[PDB]
């Protein structure tokens, strides 16, 4: 039995982190076992359809590097991979289940069901269509066969419901959650086929998991209360159920409850892998991608929300995750999201990149800001800035003094770094460096020689010099800054500082 898993999102909007993590654990489990990773688009509910969802899903999976072996876009041996295109399949299996005792016809109109729901509510009760109520309602169990024929002949709309067994203990086994039991008298007669012949999610999914030879169903815990019904649908069809693994919801950074988009808005962190623009507002929610997260760092971060790399390394690549991943070690306890941790991962991955690997994106940033520098200087600037960077764009945004002279000087910094003797000192410094081979270490030695001839610590020259070149006391070491911007730009900035601050 070749392992086969499917990511089965409905097209109802952008992928949340929980959905990315489910797709990832699908992919890892499949690849770890030499099996197949299927994408099935679960679009049976036409009214909940969100335009652009399916494109977003393909694009996010491609960005992260987990392309489905089978999908609507790519094809595969169980095409069509959109459920809206599988109606003939569901039609034939509907006929099959109606030959059993597990399904029946229900003619109740939505107004009739609204009425009985309101009667229960008024009493403090919740109406369920189940073993206790089905005999007072309008269906093929409660109505004589000749009346059912009459209704059918008149084209009376109906749904198909599952007939829950009476008082039956269903013993279930989940890879994550372990063993537990459900009595069917807690469950209702769920709708399996809507009144247009389209299956509901529950029926379409056991039909398609059976037809697509799925061996392991990995999904979120919101589906756990449905597992008993799904096992009983396999039983009704004469089929063996796959194995199940239910993932606990990602928790808020702080306080009780699940992570939501409202948290990311409220605290300033992205919630979707890629940009997405809401139709109903025109608003665009920026993705991790567009904010500068590397996909390798993003997916490493998502992987850790419930899985501990068996080798104890925090930093792990896609291919090492494939080799290491054990679905049996995925934790049942919920994992808290951490925006700081996501930034930490990006910073860690950025340090592991060579200056050359950063250089293409750095040049794109430089171009967007209308600046140019030689490849050789850009690589040195990347080297000098990358340790303190989280995103490639930080190398420019926090390093603007490499490309732009200061137009003013921070008042606090000026009081600290610039004294009534500083002007004369900086002009002497200009005279010293004007004849140098303008290399960092040579510059540093020349500054040291001026300091010791004047009886000063290094800081007495370096601090006003940094202020002169940067406009505040930020940046990397002054001699390397000077080498990058060059002799002419260095002197020109010392001159402007003298003219401004003496
Ligand atoms: N369409 C369902 C699929 C659940 C499953 O994997 O069975 C969802 O979006 O959650």
Author numbering: 2 to 503
Please give me the paper's original passages concerning this structure.
Glutamyl-tRNA synthetase (GluRS) is essential for tRNA aminoacylation and is under investigation as a bacterial drug target. GluRS catalyzes tRNA aminoacylation: the binding of glutamate to tRNA. The structures of Elizabethkingia GluRSs reported here share ∼97% sequence identity. EmGluRS and EaGluRS are monomeric enzymes that assemble with a prototypical GluRS topology with an N-terminal tRNA synthetase class I (E and Q) catalytic domain and a C-terminal anticodon-binding domain.
EmGluRS was co-crystallized with glutamate, while EaGluRS is an apo structure. EmGluRS shares ∼97% sequence identity with EaGluRS but less than 39% sequence identity with any other structure in the Protein Data Bank. The EmGluRS and EaGluRS structures are very similar and have a root-mean-squared difference of ∼1.3 Å for the alignment of all main-chain Cα atoms. ENDScript analyses revealed that despite having <40% sequence similarity, EmGluRS and EaGluRS share significant secondary-structural similarity with other bacterial GluRSs and other aminoacyl-tRNA synthetases, including some that have shown promise as drug targets. The N-terminal tRNA synthetase binding domains of all of these proteins have a sizeable accessible glutamate-binding site that is evident in the surface plot. Intriguingly, the glutamate-binding cavity has been probed to develop promising inhibitors for Pseudomonas aeruginosa GluRS.
